[PDB]
Amino acid sequence: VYRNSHTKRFSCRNSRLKYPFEQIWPTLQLSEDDAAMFRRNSRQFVVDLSQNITLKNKFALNKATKIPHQDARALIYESNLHLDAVGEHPRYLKIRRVTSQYGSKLMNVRKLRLLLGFKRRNFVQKLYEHTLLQQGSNKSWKVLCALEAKMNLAVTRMGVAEDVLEATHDLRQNNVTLNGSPAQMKHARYLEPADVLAVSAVSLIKQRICKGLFEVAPNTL
Amino acid sequence: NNPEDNIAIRNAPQKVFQLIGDPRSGVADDVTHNPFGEITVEMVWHQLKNEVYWYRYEFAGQTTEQSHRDSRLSDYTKNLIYLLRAKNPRKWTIEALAEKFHIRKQRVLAILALKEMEAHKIESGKQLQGPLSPYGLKVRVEDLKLLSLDPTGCGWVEP
Amino acid sequence: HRFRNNKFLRLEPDLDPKVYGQTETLQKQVDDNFSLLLAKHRLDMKAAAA
Amino acid sequence: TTRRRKLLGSRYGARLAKKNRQQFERARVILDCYSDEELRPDSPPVAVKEVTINTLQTMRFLFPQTSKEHLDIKQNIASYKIFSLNRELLSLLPK
Amino acid sequence: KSKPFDGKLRLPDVSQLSDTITVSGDAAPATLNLDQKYMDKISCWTQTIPSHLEMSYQNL
Ligand SMILES: [K+]
């Protein structure tokens, strides 16, 4: 599978956006043309107001700062005739059908695979089955906890890797230890609230961070 | 202990007692809404050069405020916790330190472990070498006094 | 004061960290302070002796 | 074809006890190892006398104001540091 | 002609200050202070550290 969909540029696809793709890698450098393509999902033109508005402005118009996590879907992908689509005749407003769920559900499962570092689907399925047996009342939060308990994602949170993909390579090279020794079942285990992570390749990681921030370091000491 | 300058007092458990009906003839608990909160999401950042959006999920977003302060305590505060524990372990228990600095007990113990490891490196001679040597300080527990902001305004007094 | 910009009356500019290194620059600053103190003892001894 | 030596790990406390026993004993008291009955060591606790801290941020990063409060903190740290150096020097000056 | 140094370390208890001011005396930010200067590099994770993790950059 030497496909373009396995590269960062085209990793994520969303059919409900004006530009079908979506950018999720915070360290990817885009060209001028690529940035223009992605920018079409951020700016929209309003007829009556005769202005361009952004996605952030749309949230402010709806008075949305902290909302139930299931309600953000209706804001990102839908439009309203009284706030953001004023002046458009109702005949030309887009309303979804019950037949679009499958595309959305498949897309979200693809996102979980991408965040974990291009994992296989069976990997995600077993992760979901694991949470079904653990104690807890809210199913949604149990899934979130499982993602955080993964070792490679935790290494990314520490701030020593550019992204999850780089963190995974570090584990294969044993650049990070668990409780003083290299981890066992590092790709399959979950971290516990008392685990300790340390860097064993100190020289390598220090060079990585210094080079990354060399240009943003001040010239006066 | 005023809500204006005490975020902790603002983020305090609420005692809920709501009723519908007539207290003289018949009443029932009001169960028409959920006043205990739910999981929330919020957009935090937008990078205009790469078109990247950041979303933050909070378990108790509707009943808390400024939760980002707990994990971003200054280095001065952490050193103060380390010195207080060493000075008098009998009075400065994990419970007392957690209450003093408005953090959890797990965070208090974790901070102590990391500071202890750093101290060993400094004593062994692995950190603060060369031009930065003067910044490694050895402190005797007896020669330590904690000042208080008793007088209103600027000024710290010994007692 | 004629030396409005050169407030500290320096003879050489501070080393650039991006070229000579942060550690080298910090050591240079320490050496500069010691030289000023040493030069002060230098002039007094020569004047007293000769 | 790797020249990197194989790494077999060990817990931090395990290595410390063999390199510096005094530091290991001090850490146990600080980390509250004598409060739980199950984990309480048999050896009696040792009193803590001296600790080491890093003050680089508190001196050059955290207190920029010109008020007396910020100046006093920096001066006290500097004065205490000089006392520590002088005590070490006095131990060596005598012939 | 002033009192000599006593030899003791005097440190103020910064735990008694109001929540509207930081340790350095500046105004306390009510939200995460993110900057475009660091959010496009490896620092993006440093600025968004969660509350269930304790990280030390002196020991990594
Ligand atoms: K797959």
- Chain D partners within 8 Å of B123 (Cβ): 23, 52
Residue to substitute from B140, B146, B154, interface E, most E β-carbons within 10 A: B146
Q: How many CA atoms lie within 13 A of C10 on its CB side?
A: 12
Task: Please name the residue that has the structure tokens 């050169």.
Answer: C6
Nearest residue of D to residue E11, measured between CA atoms: D73
Structure tokens at A3: 């496909």
With vertex at residue A140, the alpha carbon angle to CA E42 and CA B53, rounded to the nearest 5 degrees, is 35
Residues 31-50 of C with CB under 8 A from A: none
Which residues are CB-neighbours of B47 under 8 A, at least 6 positions away?
A26, E36, E39, E40
CA-derived radius of gyration, chain E: 18
- Chain D partners within 8 Å of E9 (Cβ): 76-77, 80
- Chain C partners within 8 Å of A220 (Cβ): 14, 17
Cα A110 to middle of ligand 1, angstroms: 8
Own/partner contacts of C28-36, CB < 8 Å, gap of 24 or more, are C29/B131, C30/B131
d(CA A110, CA A11): 9
Task: Please name the residue that has the structure tokens 């118009």.
Answer: A61
d(CA A74, CA B143): 62
Own/partner contacts of E2-10, CB < 8 Å, gap of 24 or more, are E5/D79, E5/D83, E7/B143, E7/D80, E7/D83, E8/B143, E8/B144, E8/B145, E8/D80, E9/B139, E9/B143, E9/B144, E9/B145, E9/D76, E9/D77, E9/D80, E10/B145, E10/B147, E10/B158, E10/D72, E10/D76
Q: Chain D closest CA to A181's CA: distance in Å? A: 4
- Chain E partners within 8 Å of A208 (Cβ): 42
Task: Please name the residue that has the structure tokens 């002088």.
Answer: D86
Task: Please name the residue that has the structure tokens 């070229």.
Answer: C19
Amino acid letter for position A55: L
Instruction: Calculate the alpha carbon distances from A165 to A7, A59, A189, D27 in Å.
Output: 11, 32, 18, 37
Burial class (CB in 10 A: 0-12, 13-18, 19+), A210: exposed
For residue C10, what is the DSSP state? -
Amino acid letter for position A193: P
d(CA A47, CA D78): 66
Amino acid letter for position A75: L
Which residues are CB-neighbours of D86 under 8 A, at least 6 positions away?
none
Amino acid letter for position B47: Q
Structure tokens at D47: 């009193």
Three-state DSSP at D72 gives: helix
Q: Chain E closest CA to D3's CA: distance in Å? A: 24
Chain B: which residues have CB within 8 Å of chain C?
130-132
Task: Please name the residue that has the structure tokens 């393509």.
Answer: A37
Per the CB < 8 A criterion, the answer to whether A151 and A186 are in contact is yes
d(CA B80, CA B121): 19
Please name which of A199, A174, A205, A200 lies closest in space to residue A187, comparing C-alpha atoms.
A174
d(CA A140, CA A134): 13
Per the CB < 8 A criterion, the answer to whether B149 and D90 are in contact is no
Residue to substitute from D3, D4, D5, D7, interface A, most A β-carbons within 10 A: D7
d(CA A97, CA B20): 41
Decide if B130 and C29 are in contact by the 8 Å CB cutoff: no
Cα A131 to middle of ligand 1, angstroms: 20
Sign of CA dihedral E3, B86, D52, D42: positive
Task: Please name the residue that has the structure tokens 């550290």.
Answer: E49
Cα A23 to middle of ligand 1, angstroms: 19
d(CA E34, CA A204): 27
d(CA A219, CA E19): 34
Per the CB < 8 A criterion, the answer to whether D46 and D33 are in contact is no
If phi > 0 it is left, if psi is from -120 to 50 it is alpha, else beta; for residue A185 that is left
Decide if D73 and E58 are in contact by the 8 Å CB cutoff: no
Please name which of A126, A196, A119, A188 lies closest in space to residue A155, comparing C-alpha atoms.
A196
Chain D touches chain B, with at least 3 Cβ pairs below 8 Å, answer: yes
Chain C touches chain A, with at least 3 Cβ pairs below 8 Å, answer: yes
Chain D: which residues have CB within 8 Å of chain B?
12, 16, 20, 23, 27, 29-32, 48-59, 62, 67-69, 72, 77, 80-81, 84
d(CA B111, CA D43): 25
| Widest distance between CA atoms in chain A | 66
Amino acid letter for position A95: I
Amino acid letter for position A141: W
Residues 96-125 of B with CB under 8 A from A: 106
Out of E10, E25, E58, closest to residue D76 by CB = E10
Please name which of C27, B79, A220 lies closest in space to residue D62, comparing C-alpha atoms.
B79
Antiparallel, parallel or unpaired: β B144-147 and E9-12: parallel
Phi, psi of A61 (to 5 degrees): -60, -30
Three-state DSSP at A1 gives: coil
- Chain A partners within 8 Å of C25 (Cβ): 221
Q: Other CB atoms closer than 10 Å to residue A13's CB: what's the count?
A: 13
Amino acid letter for position C34: F
Three-state DSSP at E40 gives: coil
State this model's resolution in angstroms.
3.1
With vertex at residue D71, the alpha carbon angle to CA D66 and CA D76, rounded to the nearest 5 degrees, is 175
Per the CB < 8 A criterion, the answer to whether A14 and A24 are in contact is no
Structure tokens at B5: 């300058």
Structure tokens at B108: 């208090």
Q: Chain E closest CA to A86's CA: distance in Å? A: 33
Q: How was this model experimentally determined?
A: cryo-EM
Structure tokens at A220: 């006066």
The number of helix segments (H) and strand segments (E) in chain A equals 9, 7
Task: Please name the residue that has the structure tokens 């060209």.
Answer: A31
Nearest residue of A to residue E52, measured between CA atoms: A193
d(CA A84, CA A55): 10
- Chain E partners within 8 Å of A164 (Cβ): none
| Widest distance between CA atoms in chain D | 62
Nearest residue of D to residue B79, measured between CA atoms: D53
d(CA D35, CA D29): 9
Three-state DSSP at A164 gives: helix
Per the CB < 8 A criterion, the answer to whether A217 and C25 are in contact is no
Antiparallel, parallel or unpaired: β D50-54 and A197-199: unpaired
Per the CB < 8 A criterion, the answer to whether A113 and A120 are in contact is yes
d(CA B132, CA C39): 24
d(CA E50, CA E27): 22
Cα B32 to middle of ligand 1, angstroms: 44
d(CA D7, CA A94): 60
B43-52: burial string, b at 16+ Cβ within 10 Å, e else: bebbbeebbb
